[model samples]
Target: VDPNQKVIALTFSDGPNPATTNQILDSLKKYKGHATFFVLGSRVQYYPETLIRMLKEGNEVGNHSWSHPLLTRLSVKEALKQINDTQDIIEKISGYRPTLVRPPYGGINDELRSQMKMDVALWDVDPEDWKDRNKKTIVDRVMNQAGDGRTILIHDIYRTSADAADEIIKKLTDQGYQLVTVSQLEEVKKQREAKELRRQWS
Candidate 1:
């Protein structure tokens, strides 16, 4: 690995659905790339097999809440339950506990943030694929917004997302960026420390 290489974290939220999520998985597999999935609890119940597939394929899974509600709108108690319950289901299916959680709609407030003690994943790049169905525009949005050492958020609930993701992976890889999970990208700090220690001994 080049010490100067930049890393990008790619994350998908609000899915386990067959049409969109499955297609996205196909693309990731095609490129031998890995990403994080912030999934909803209810969707996990609806498609437990998808959750299993994600784990089996070595993708990191995270909680997005039980129903994808605007976390800030809910009472603190409700919001806590929403997150806890989603984590519960994911753990049950994947046998891997998630250390990351992204608030639905990015609706985070002081109350919700304080109540949660996990890595709160947010995005630096979002194409708003939900609102835009045009594939090229969606891809352009991601390519334009992304920078080195940034987290990119996309959803796997729409056709536009699948198309955009396919193109994004291709373009970003071609640009020599390594796509990584949130933890993997963030762990660069730790890796750097280790390298420094080695150099000191050398």
Candidate 2:
């Protein structure tokens, strides 16, 4: 976990759709890189094969709640159901339950956080692909904010995001960043923390 080696955790939310998510998967495969997909349960039901493809391709998957609704608007029970239902569906299809979850709109509060033990994955960089559909701007925004030990958020439901992902992989790898899963990134963080603790105690 060399801090000097640029490491980025590329994450996509709201899909396992054939039109865009599959294209992103194909691009990642072409580059031999890994990413994290925060999948919607409704989309997972619609595209189980796409989710299977993501798993088979060695990409990380996480629960993105069902229907992509704002969980904050729901009651605690509803929110828990939202996340747990997605986890069950993903586990049924992918044979592994997701330990990472990104609440819709990054809207997890302390109550929601306390209700679950899953890692609440959030992004340090966002290209706003949902707002801006331009590929170049998306790519530039990501590369500009990316550095060692940062997570990037992108959506797989849009073509511009897919294209930006392609560009991101090429540019980041060229800059010596290894695209890794969230768990791997966590391992790096934990190791760094342990080293810092040792220094403080010494």
Candidate 3:
């Protein structure tokens, strides 16, 4: 990796829908970019082929719980079951074990966290694509908030967001950003952290 290159993690959630998700995939494929998909377990079986396509196209997948419930409201057993079940199915279908989890509605607590085995991820940039379905609005919001090391959140279940994909990727790449999967961004972060620490002692 180039130490000076700017990187961003573009994450899509709540999908495997061929209609919308595949549109985003085509854009990423065209741009030679990669992203992370936080898929719901409930949708996994219905679109098993989509998950395989995601991995085959060099994207990463993470767990987004089973039913999109607020885990903080559920019992620890129930909450862990939501996560565990998703992990198992994602692995079974895609043959890739997710190492990260983004709790539905950003809900979680100490009680839920203690028993979870995967790293918890949340977004630093959100376009609220779920509510505003306009493609230009989604693109503008993301561009305004875009920055180095920022993780952007969008749902791949919407037509508007999918339509915005190409412009978002093209603009960001034109600005010299390397769009990468979440895991790749984390590795870059760790390397930079170690380098900074070394300079501190020098």
- Report clash pairs, candidate 1: none
TM-score of 3: 0.96
Candidate number of the best TM-score: 3
**Local accuracy of candidate 1 as per-residue lDDT tens digits, 74-161:** 8899999999999888878767789998998888987788788888988888888788878898889889988878889889888888
Query: For every model shown, what is its TM-score relative to the native structure?
Result: 0.90, 0.93, 0.96
User: Candidate 1: lDDT over CA atoms?
Assistant: 0.85
For residues 1-202, what per-residue lDDT tens digits would candidate 3 score against the true structure? 4546999999999998899999889989988899999999989978999999999999999999998999998999999999999988998886789999999999989878778978999999999988899999999999999999999999999889898877899999889889999989999998888777777778
Give lDDT tens digits, candidate 2, residues 23-121. 888888887778999999989988999989998998899989998778889999999999998988888887888999899999889999999779998
Better of 1 and 2 by lDDT: 2
lDDT of 1 at 191: 74
Instruction: Score each candidate by Cα lDDT.
Output: 0.85, 0.88, 0.91
Candidate 1 residue 175 C-alpha distance from true site, Å: 1.7
lDDT of 1 at 167: 90
- Better lDDT candidate (2, 3): 3
List residue ranges in candidate 1 displaced over 4 A. Answer: 1-3, 192-202
Give the Cα-based TM-score of candidate 2 against the true structure: 0.93
- The lDDT leader among the candidates is 3
